[PDB]
Amino acid sequence: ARPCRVSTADRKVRKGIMAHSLEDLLNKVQDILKLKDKPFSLVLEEDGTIVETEEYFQALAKDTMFMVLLKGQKWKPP
Amino acid sequence: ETPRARPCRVSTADRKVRKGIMAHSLEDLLNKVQDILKLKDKPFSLVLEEDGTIVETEEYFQALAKDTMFMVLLKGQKWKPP
């Protein structure tokens, strides 16, 4: 049961969220970050690498900054 | 090679799609990347996204940092500067 640091796409709000899995993370992120709708994609905040498997989500360091993307939203350089 | 798979960040040559892929070796990685990145055909070369350094041995692939961004090149594609 693990600690994730998660940003919105405009990087204005970053929050620490505990998750058992990628899917659990994705189920929590809307309420926590007060997203306008459900997330479409989870990406690495540093470079926009798409996190789309559980095994890859779990191999990343606990201090990894994640970014949620809603439909049509794209990762952008900080 | 590595009993436990290692996380790789992998870019297409146009840098529009970037994805985290788990891999046990260079060969395993190269076996996986076409379906994952939706490549039109099999990869020809794996390169460092940063400077186009060719990754062509398993030992060099394994020595790289986990956050290294890779780039796949298909036949006749060339690394280009970002």
Curated annotation (Swiss-Prot), chain B:
Q: In which tissues is it expressed?
A: Expressed almost exclusively in adipose tissue, including subcutaneous and epididymal white adipose tissue (at protein level). Although abundantly present in brown adipose tissue at the mRNA level, the protein is almost undetectable in this tissue, or at moderate levels. Expressed in the mammary gland, in stromal adipose tissue, but becomes undetectable at the end of pregnancy and during lactation (at protein level). Expressed at low levels in skeletal muscle and heart.
Q: What is the effect of changing residue 78 to A?
A: Slightly inhibits interaction with PLIN1
* Post-translational events: Ubiquitinated and targeted to proteasomal degradation, resulting in a short half-life (about 15 minutes in 3T3-L1 cells). Protein stability depends on triaclyglycerol synthesis, fatty acid availability and lipid droplet formation.
Instruction: Summarize the impact of residue 16 to A.
Output: Slightly inhibits interaction with PLIN1
List residues of the CIDE-N domain.
Answer: 4-81
Instruction: Please describe, based on the UniProt annotation, the reported consequence of changing residue 18 to E.
Output: Abolishes CIDE-N/CIDE-N interaction between the 2 homodimer subunits
Q: Which domain of life is it from?
A: Eukaryota
Q: Where in the cell is it found?
A: Lipid droplet; Endoplasmic reticulum; Nucleus
Q: Which residues form a coiled coil?
A: none
**Entry's induction text:** Up-regulated under conditions that enhance triacylglycerol deposition, including rosiglitazone treatment and high-fat diet. This up-regulation is mediated by PPARG. Up-regulated by isoproterenol, a beta-agonist, and oleic acid treatment. This induction is due to protein stabilization. Down-regulated upon hypertonic conditions.
Knockout-associated phenotype: Mutant animals are born in a Mendelian ratio and appear physically normal at birth. Mice display increased energy expenditure, lower levels of plasma triglycerides and free fatty acids. The body weights of wild-type and mutant mice fed a standard diet do not differ up to 14 weeks of age, nor does food intake. From 16 weeks of age, the body weight of mutant mice significantly decreases compared with that of wild-type mice. When animals are fed a high-fat diet, the gain in body weight is significantly smaller for mutant mice than for wild-type.
Impact when changing residue 38 to A:
Inhibits interaction with PLIN1
The entry's function note states:
Lipid transferase specifically expressed in white adipose tissue, which promotes unilocular lipid droplet formation by mediating lipid droplet fusion. Lipid droplet fusion promotes their enlargement, restricting lipolysis and favoring lipid storage. Localizes on the lipid droplet surface, at focal contact sites between lipid droplets, and mediates atypical lipid droplet fusion by undergoing liquid-liquid phase separation (LLPS) and promoting directional net neutral lipid transfer from the smaller to larger lipid droplets.
Q: Name the family the entry cites.
A: Belongs to the CIDE family.
Notes concerning its domains: The RKKR polybasic motif mediates binding to acidic phospholipids, such as phosphatidic acid, phosphatidylinositol and phosphatidylserine, inhibiting the ability to mediate lipid droplet fusion.
Subunit-structure text: Homodimer. Homooligomer; undergoes liquid-liquid phase separation (LLPS) via its N-terminus, facilitating lipid droplet fusion, occurs at the lipid droplet contact sites. Interacts with CIDEA. Interacts with PLIN1. Interacts with NFAT5; this interaction is direct and retains NFAT5 in the cytoplasm. Interacts with CEBPB. Interacts with isoform CLSTN3beta of CLSTN3; inhibiting the lipid transferase activity of CIDEC.
- Which named protein is this? Lipid transferase CIDEC
Q: Which organism is it from?
A: Mus musculus (Mouse)
Q: Which taxonomic lineage is given here?
A: Eukaryota, Metazoa, Chordata, Craniata, Vertebrata
